[PDB]
Ligand binder design. Structure first.
Ligand SMILES: CCCCCCCCCCCCCCCCCC(=O)OC[C@H](COP(=O)([O-])OCC(O)COP(=O)([O-])OC[C@@H](COC(=O)CCCCCCCCCCCCCCCCC)OC(=O)CCCCCCCCCCCCCCCCC)OC(=O)CCCCCCCCCCCCCCCCC
Ligand code: BCL
Ligand code: BCL
Ligand SMILES: CC[C@H]1c2cc3[nH]c4c(c3C)C(=O)[C@H](C(=O)OC)c4c3nc(cc4[nH]c(cc(n2)[C@@H]1C)c(C(C)=O)c4C)[C@@H](C)[C@@H]3CCC(=O)OC/C=C(\C)CCC[C@H](C)CCC[C@H](C)CCCC(C)C
Ligand SMILES: COC1=C(OC)C(=O)C(C/C=C(\C)CC/C=C(\C)CC/C=C(\C)CC/C=C(\C)CC/C=C(\C)CC/C=C(\C)CC/C=C(\C)CC/C=C(\C)CC/C=C(\C)CCC=C(C)C)=C(C)C1=O
Ligand SMILES: CCCCCCCCCCCCCCCCCC(=O)OC[C@H](COP(=O)([O-])OCC[N+](C)(C)C)OC(=O)CCCCCCCCCCCCCCCCC
Ligand SMILES: COC(C)(C)C/C=C/C(C)=C/C=C/C(C)=C/C=C/C(C)=C/C=C/C=C(C)/C=C/C=C(\C)CC/C=C(\C)CCC=C(C)C
Ligand SMILES: COC(C)(C)C/C=C/C(C)=C/C=C/C(C)=C/C=C/C(C)=C/C=C/C=C(C)/C=C/C=C(\C)CC/C=C(\C)CCC=C(C)C
Ligand SMILES: COC(C)(C)C/C=C/C(C)=C/C=C/C(C)=C/C=C/C(C)=C/C=C/C=C(C)/C=C/C=C(\C)CC/C=C(\C)CCC=C(C)C
Ligand SMILES: COC(C)(C)C/C=C/C(C)=C/C=C/C(C)=C/C=C/C(C)=C/C=C\C=C(C)\C=C\C=C(/C)CC/C=C(\C)CCC=C(C)C
Ligand SMILES: COC(C)(C)C/C=C/C(C)=C/C=C/C(C)=C/C=C/C(C)=C\C=C\C=C(C)\C=C\C=C(/C)CC/C=C(\C)CCC=C(C)C
Ligand SMILES: [Fe+2]
Lengths: 43, 254, 281, 304, 60, 53, 53, 43, 44, 44, 53, 43, 53, 53
């Protein structure tokens, strides 16, 4: 189909890096959420 | 007539406000139907005729009887839309779906698409009541003199790429309105070309045209007559020039 | 969905932000980055209005009213049930308006036409902001802004105007009035003139700009021109809204008393004060 | 980047005296003038006026009106020019006392008001007829007269009709700069809160809509002036990319559009409906409704 | 010569981060301008007489 | 009842689909808000009351 | 149900996905605010009281 | 006759699918109104 | 046959399968979170 | 779940990455300002 | 009475369909609203009264 | 004759389907009016 | 009286049918409301009383 | 008087007929309402009294 000019290979690469960064983000965010539950819980 | 309810709480005030709602409904009908004289029937991207032709029906044709024996114009009509219909359009569908653009296939300033689009107005010029042409060069307009402002004539014409292309020669004027519509250029390439005054900013030392760059000033449509200019040529010129705010931007500096 | 001429203009480009992402149409409408934003904000504000009136239990569209926090709340954010809804709706409304303007910009540069329209709209956004953002901040509290009710912002107008007596004596208000009246006047005249040329007496040919100029020269000795009247009505509206914003930003910040006492500086000029005659003697 | 607000270069020529389409040329003048201060924003020609019968009627009557009010201003000022130029705004040709009802007031202030009003009557109606005739002589449509008639409707409702229905010329408006403002306020305050006059709300809607619309129209036509959109009569008959671009701006923006003639139709109505709704809402104030806030409560747009 | 990253993945990663941070910088600029606007407003309000913060409420 | 499919020989499915989607969403939102404004069916206030909060 | 896939023979993925993102995010924010509107179901103030803060 | 360019067969298929979706919608709605009438009757 | 979009039944089935994968993932997350919020604070 | 990479065939990734940057930064400020409003959750 | 199939030779099915759909819907709403605005036909108030809630 | 260019047969067909839909509508409406009358009459 | 089919030679039946439809609906609503006003013809209040509801 | 038919040579029939319809409707709607205002002529209140309801 390819509406944007990209092929399955390029898209696989780009998705790999995107999800790398995503899991990094979620890691950092769950860390900070944990620390905040430590400081000022909310449940 | 205070405290006089015909029924329930309904008095002259209520009757009047409701009557107004009704009149207003009819009025929106009237206006949104009279705004249909141009553009309808609705098309697809294929040029066909579509199923959704609006919930308001196209109205019944009227007639404009033109001055100077230019004939009768009927709106809405097939002649009206087919005259002003463009063909041989340099465009390519971006998708089989509808609601997506259509890219210009070639040079758009020339191919007459997008902001650079023009419409086939009739190759007869615009006239005053007396039937004389509306736009005359200031030299044929007997009695016309600059009454104020910066006389641009003879000033260089800086363009969007900051480069210079020529010198102004003459001013084309709306005699019945007494104002300057187009200005002419004596280009380096030995050619004369018009440019709308609304797209040219007279400085003290020059005339700036930030719309288009220099490569474009040469391919501007010309005039088959040097004393008159028709509506068609006007649209072509104006579209070409105005399209540079999009299609020559990679060239525009400062 | 297209008009008989809508095609050759449906080309790509003219986008301040975004690019191919969002360069498409939904029915007649163009939706860019800012179309998405304005839809989101508008929808959210609408749904919040409805929930606010739902919490209240009111469902009549004329009696629905979401009011700002108390004046004692000051400039802090309040509970949703005591001002937070009004505040979020204000946020969303402003985002929606600014995004409408920027959408207009994208379109103006795709169709290659000037940016006069979003400029005009900017003044209206400026006035709305003057009412709900600036004037409060300078007056110290969100609660001095107007509510989102069809028939309640009128009560806000009335009370706010009677705080300073007859607001009629505010001069910037006078100018706003005058420009508004002149705007309606010029609008009617323009429309009537044009229709009278295009649609003349039966059995007569269409008319031209020369006939318009001549008719109004005949009537009042001056004609402003086909371009000048548009210029004029535009400027009239803008200066009206300009004066209207100026009238409100100075009402409770620089002025504090009845507005009538302002004109008494002309009476009280020493060389005609003591004179016993007239109204003020 | 030239927005076309102020004209850069001026040009001129022999004045454009007129178009002979059945106009009486002798009732027309022959002297013109150029005044560049306007040329910057419009045409500079302060062109020939038409001096006709209806115009003479109007000028005479209205000048008598003006000078009558000025006469009473003087008498009210002690003939002291400094008082005149002091209390100029606070002065008034106040309206008759209610004691007289609709009879000819038995006072000086009152009869002066009555006469000034007769003069205004003559002037305004003469001017309306002058509009009709100037549009009939050039062979144009009478849209301008039917628009003015809307304004006349409100003005009458305020001076002549509403009072006759209420039985007092006291109800009519004083001739002053601050007293007619005071009159508006007292009118609202006496009759509830005028805001709750639905027809007041509608007249407001249409005033704001007129400003909305003229800003829209003007900004558009200046935006498409680079394609000659200012020349409209020729884009109704010979459509060009100006009209197409404007229509498509408004379509892509709000889903609907107009034509270079139908926007003019929209303007003629937002204008006249400002004073058609106002006249009605003023008629109904006191004749049908002694208080509007309670009418609202009863009618559901105001709470109990 | 310097600035040359041999790896395809590292080149893609530094590009995407640049794009994301560009966007976040735009958003921060906007937020900061709004903040300066409102705060300068409040401050200029502190320059005003005391009757500005005394005014009666319209109840709405 | 046997030729309803002929409706699509009349209306275009794109428009019909978008229309009914909007219609259903708004209808649902309005009914939900209606209940939410009637405190005998406000599931939130109920659950507060039933569970003693 | 077997043939729901033809929806993409009617609509384009791009516009549909824009719609979906906008609508879902809007709905989420809406419901979160609905809850934060109740002195109950407002996780923040609930936790504030529970822990006596 | 077809104002949209469909034939009877394309229409019939589209209609089978539309009907499937509609009946699924109605099914879930019935389930839910039932659960409600069991939880807090409105009649 | 009929395609207002260009996709034939093949691309359509593909795209649909992936879209439904994403939908069921979304829904799994939401179901989990709803069960949790029920445990912590029921609403029926 | 494994064919999600096909989204970059739909949307240009450059613009999507810029847009995510915007969206996430704005969400962050939104919540920080939400939390800052509450004395229990304000830290300044 | 037998020739009424000619209202289709005079009108267009699209406009009539959409118009009468709008008409039926707005009618239904107005009627439900008239009921709700009367305590003796509000099925909701009646229910919370009947079930002693 | 036709102000829209339909032939008697397409029209007879359209009318058949329209009447069928209308009668389904009325049938359900009657079911409902009956239920309502049994539950809470108004006449 | 028999020549009254000639009014169709002065009027467009489309216009006329639309205008008649609108007029009829509005007249009906107006009348039914003039009735709902009078407490004696508000069949709903009448039912409430008759049925002791 | 039998030469009054020239009125159709002066005035257009369509305009006259439309104006006539509107005129008569407004007059009649008005007369009926003026009658309604007075109680002695309000046939509905009259009936409510004749039948003692
Ligand atoms: C239970 C109730 C339920 C609800 C009921 C609802 C029923 C709805 C029915 C439908 C009504 C729709 C009306 C709108 C259509 C108009 C469309 C349009 O723009 O142009 C049409 C089109 C315009 O033609 P054109 O394109 O300009 O070119 C025509 C010529 O070629 C060249 O043109 P020309 O130069 O020869 O003539 C130009 C003129 C063409 O028209 C004419 O020439 C005649 C126009 C009418 C002039 C007046 C008639 C003469 C007698 C007047 C009496 C006044 C007494 C005062 C003293 C005398 C002053 C002279 O163009 C127009 O635009 C005409 C429209 C003007 C409308 C009136 C504007 C001024 C009124 C201001 C208020 C004053 C009265 C008080 C109102 C409130 C009372 C409580 O004309 C027509 O289609 C026919 C004319 C229509 C006749 C008038 C009927 C409508 C009047 C409505 C006024 C509002 C009433 C208030 C509402 C209710 C509130 C409670
Ligand atoms: C202008 C300074 C005062 C003000 C004083 C008044 C006065 C005085 C009146 C109203 C009236 C109106 N005002 Mg206002 N109004 C103000 C600010 C606003 C704002 C805003 C976003 O700030 C809006 C949307 C409105 C809304 C309205 C409409 C309900 C109504 C007609 C306006 C109109 O015709 O516009 C012109 C433009 C159009 C014709 C386009 C149509 C726009 C529609 C009609 C707006 C409706 C909004 C909708 C109900 C809410 C969104 C969901 N006003 C401020 C606070 N306004 C009049 C009325 O009748 O109120 C009952 C009235 O009497
Ligand atoms: C505090 C007092 C009340 C109030 C009391 C009234 C009263 C009373 C009236 C209105 C009326 C109006 N008010 Mg107010 N109004 C209030 C609140 C508002 C607010 C607001 C934001 O709060 C707004 C925007 C408005 C809006 C309006 C306008 C929509 C409307 C008049 C329009 C017009 O053209 O008048 C001006 C138009 C004319 C008078 C036309 C006259 C034309 C004639 C031909 C002039 C002759 C010319 C003469 C010879 C001079 C020659 C000059 C030389 C040749 C140069 N009001 C308050 C709440 N308002 C009017 C209305 O319609 O009532 C419902 C009106 O009478
Ligand atoms: C449709 C509603 C709007 C309107 C329209 C309107 N007024 C009009 C017209 C129209 C269409 C004209 O054609 C006519 C005109 O010539 O305008 C330039 C006019 C006119 N409306 C005028 C003014 C005016 N219009 C107003 C407003 C409005 N009229 C409404 C907003 C207002 C105010 C405050 O509301 C005023 C003050 C005049 C400029 C003119 C009426 C001319 C007239 O009757 O003059 C009589 C007096 C003299 C000739 C002598 C004066 C003596 C002194 C030396 C002064
Ligand atoms: C020179 O000639 C001219 C024309 O003709 C060429 C014209 O037409 C016009 C234009 C003027 C008119 C049409 C006259 C009528 C105008 C008015 C009465 C002004 C007031 C207008 C309204 C009441 C209508 C307002 C409508 C709005 C704001 C649109 C509402 C729509 C939405 C919120 C939906 C937006 C959808 C989006 C962004 C996309 C959704 C996205 C998804 C992902 C789904 C002018 C001025 C003109 O001068
Ligand atoms: C409340 C007042 C109206 C609010 C706007 C409602 C309509 C809207 O937003 O879009 C309609 C839609 C939006 O665009 P659209 O693309 O959906 O409309 C298509 C219109 N046809 C089918 C005819 C091509 O536009 C229309 O329906 C066209 C006509 C609308 C005319 C509305 C003018 C109202 C002016 C009010 C003046 C009086 C105020 C007092
Ligand atoms: C105050 O007022 C109150 C409300 C209290 C009292 C007054 C109430 C009033 C005035 C009520 C008035 C009600 C009226 C006038 C109701 C009229 C209702 C009608 C006419 C309903 C019609 C419904 C029709 C329907 C549902 C038709 C459906 C048709 C279909 C589904 C068939 C589909 C058609 C196809 C496919 C066409 C075939 C096409 C081709 C090309 C073969
Ligand atoms: C006061 O008012 C209140 C609210 C109190 C009371 C009144 C309420 C009212 C008036 C409510 C009215 C409700 C109505 C009218 C509801 C109607 C609902 C309907 C008709 C719902 C229909 C749903 C249909 C669905 C979800 C269909 C889905 C279909 C699909 C997913 C498949 C789409 C088609 C495909 C893929 C086929 C494509 C094939 C080809 C060959 C292109
Ligand atoms: C005010 O009233 C309240 C709010 C209280 C109550 C009412 C609430 C209402 C009415 C809520 C309604 C909620 C609804 C209708 C929710 C519907 C949710 C749905 C339909 C969710 C669907 C989600 C789908 C997702 C997340 C799909 C994601 C897919 C992907 C990320 C991957 C797809 C990949 C593709 C297409 C690649 C293949 C592409 C090509 C071009 C080959
Ligand atoms: C420098 O000093 C000198 C003396 C040389 C000149 C100065 C002149 C001055 C200072 C003039 C000032 C004039 C002013 C301030 C005029 C202000 C007028 C205003 C603001 C008027 C506002 C509203 C007026 C209205 C609505 C009047 C309406 C009147 C009518 C509709 C009249 C209708 C007829 C009536 C009342 C009865 C007579 C009827 C018949 C048939 C005889
Ligand atoms: C009323 O509502 C409130 C606000 C109170 C509560 C509700 C809030 C809502 C509804 C929030 C919704 C949040 C959502 C939906 C967030 C979604 C976030 C997502 C999907 C984030 C994705 C992030 C992806 C990233 C950051 C990926 C970046 C990848 C790169 C930059 C590539 C380079 C790779 C590196 C550096 C890794 C090397 C190791
Ligand atoms: Fe214009």
């Amino acid at each position: 189909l390819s509406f944007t000019g990209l092929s399955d290979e390029q898209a696989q690469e780009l998705h790999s890096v995107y999800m790398s960064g995503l899991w990094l983000f979620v890691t950092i965010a769950v860390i900070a959420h944990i620390a905040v539950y430590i400081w000022r819980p909310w449940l | 007539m205070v405290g006089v309810n015909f029924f329930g709480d309904f008095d002259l005030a209520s009757l009047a406000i409701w009557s107004f709602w009704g009149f207003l409904a009819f009025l929106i009908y009237y206006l949104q139907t009279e705004n249909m004289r141009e553009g309808y029937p609705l098309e697809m991207e294929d040029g066909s005729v579509a199923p959704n032709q609006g919930l308001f029906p196209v109205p019944k044709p009227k007639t404009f009887k033109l001055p100077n024996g230019r004939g009768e114009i009927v709106m809405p009509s097939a002649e009206n839309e087919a005259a002003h219909r463009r063909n041989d359009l340099a465009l390519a569908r971006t998708s089989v779906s509808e609601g997506f653009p259509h890219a210009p296939t070639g040079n758009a300033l020339v191919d007459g698409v997008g902001p650079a689009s023009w419409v086939p107005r009739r190759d007869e010029p615009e006239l005053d009541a007396h039937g004389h042409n509306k736009i005359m060069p200031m030299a044929l307009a007997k009695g016309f003199n600059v009454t104020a402002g910066r006389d641009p004539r003879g000033l260089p014409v800086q363009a969007a790429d900051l480069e210079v292309v020529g010198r102004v020669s003459e001013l084309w004027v709306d005699v019945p309105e007494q104002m300057v519509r187009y200005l002419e250029i004596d280009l380096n390439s030995g050619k004369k070309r018009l440019v709308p005054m609304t797209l040219a900013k007279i400085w003290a030392d020059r005339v700036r045209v930030n719309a288009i760059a220099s490569d474009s000033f040469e391919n501007i449509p010309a005039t088959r007559s040097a004393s008159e200019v028709t509506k068609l040529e006007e649209d072509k010129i104006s579209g070409y020039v105005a399209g540079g705010w999009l299609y020559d931007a990679d060239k525009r500096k400062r | 969905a297209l008009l008989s001429f809508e095609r050759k203009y449906r080309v790509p480009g003219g986008t301040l932000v975004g690019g191919n992402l969002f360069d498409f149409w939904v029915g007649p409408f163009y939706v860019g980055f800012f179309g998405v934003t304005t839809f989101f904000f508008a929808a959210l504000g609408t749904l919040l209005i409805l929930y606010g009136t739902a919490m209240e239990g009111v469902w009549n569209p004329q009696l629905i009213s979401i009011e700002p926090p108390s004046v004692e709340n000051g400039l802090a954010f309040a509970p949703l049930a005591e001002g937070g809804l009004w505040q979020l709706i204000t946020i969303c409304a402003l985002g929606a308006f600014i995004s409408w303007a920027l959408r207009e910009v994208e379109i103006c540069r795709k169709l290659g036409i000037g940016l006069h329209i979003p400029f005009a709209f900017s003044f209206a956004i400026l006035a709305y902001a003057v009412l709900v953002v600036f004037r409060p901040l300078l007056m110290g509290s969100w609660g001095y802004a107007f509510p989102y009710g069809i028939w309640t912002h009128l009560d806000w107008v009335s009370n706010t105007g009677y705080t300073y007596g007859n607001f009629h004596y505010n001069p910037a208000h006078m100018l706003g009035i005058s420009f508004f009246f002149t705007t309606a006047l010029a609008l009617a005249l323009h429309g009537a003139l044009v229709l009278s040329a295009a649609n003349p007496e039966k059995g007569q040919e269409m008319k031209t700009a020369d006939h318009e100029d001549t008719f109004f020269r005949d009537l009042v000795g001056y004609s402003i021109g086909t371009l000048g009247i548009h210029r004029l009505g535009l400027l009239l509206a803008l200066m009206a809204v300009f004066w209207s914003a100026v009238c409100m930003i100075i009402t409770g910040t620089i002025w504090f008393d009845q507005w009538s006492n302002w004109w008494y500086w002309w009476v009280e000029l020493p060389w005609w004060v003591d004179i016993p005659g007239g109204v003020n003697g | 980047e030239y927005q076309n607000i102020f004209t850069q270069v001026q040009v001129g020529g022999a004045p454009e005296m007129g178009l002979v389409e059945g106009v009486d040329l002798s009732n027309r003048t022959k002297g013109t003038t150029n005044w560049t201060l306007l040329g910057w924003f419009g045409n500079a020609q302060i062109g020939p006026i038409y001096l006709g019968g209806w115009g003479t009627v109007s000028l005479i009557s209205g000048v008598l009106w003006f000078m009558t009010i000025g006469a009473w201003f003087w008498y009210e000022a002690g003939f002291n020019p400094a008082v005149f130029m002091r209390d100029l705004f606070y002065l008034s040709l106040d309206a008759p006392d209610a004691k007289y009802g609709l009879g000819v007031p038995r006072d000086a202030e009152g009869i002066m008001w009555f006469i000034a009003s007769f003069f205004m009557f003559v002037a305004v109606w003469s001017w309306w007829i002058r509009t009709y005739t100037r549009a009939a002589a050039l062979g144009m449509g009478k849209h301008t007269a039917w628009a003015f008639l809307s304004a006349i409707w409100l003005w009458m409702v305020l001076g002549f009709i509403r009072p006759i229905l209420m039985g007092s010329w006291s109800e009519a408006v004083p001739y002053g700069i601050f007293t007619h403002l005071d009159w508006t306020n007292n009118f609202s305050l006496t009759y509830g809160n005028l805001f709750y006059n639905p027809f007041h709300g509608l007249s407001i809607a249409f005033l704001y809509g007129s400003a909305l619309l003229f800003a829209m129209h003007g900004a558009t036509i200046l935006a498409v002036s680079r394609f000659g959109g200012d020349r409209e009569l020729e884009q109704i008959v010979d459509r060009g990319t100006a009209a197409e671009r404007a229509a498509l701006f408004w379509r892509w923006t709000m889903g609907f559009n107009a034509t270079m003639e139908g926007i003019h139709r929209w303007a003629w109505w937002f204008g006249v409906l400002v004073t058609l709704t106002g006249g009605i809402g003023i008629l109904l104030s006191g004749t049908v409704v002694d208080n509007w806030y309670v009418w609202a409560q009863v009618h559901g747009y105001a709470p109990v | 010569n310097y600035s040359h990253e041999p790896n395809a993945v590292i080149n893609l990663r530094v590009w995407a981060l640049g794009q994301m941070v560009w966007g976040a910088f735009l958003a921060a600029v906007g937020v900061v301008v709004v903040i300066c606007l409102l705060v300068g407003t409040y401050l200029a309000g502190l320059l005003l007489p005391e009757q500005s913060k005394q005014a009666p409420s319209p109840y709405g | 009842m046997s030729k309803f499919y002929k409706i699509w020989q009349v209306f275009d499915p794109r428009r019909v689909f978008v229309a009914q989607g909007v219609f259903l969403f708004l209808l649902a939102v309005m009914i939900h808000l209606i209940l939410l404004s009637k405190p005998d069916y406000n599931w939130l206030d109920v659950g507060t009351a039933k569970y003693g909060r």
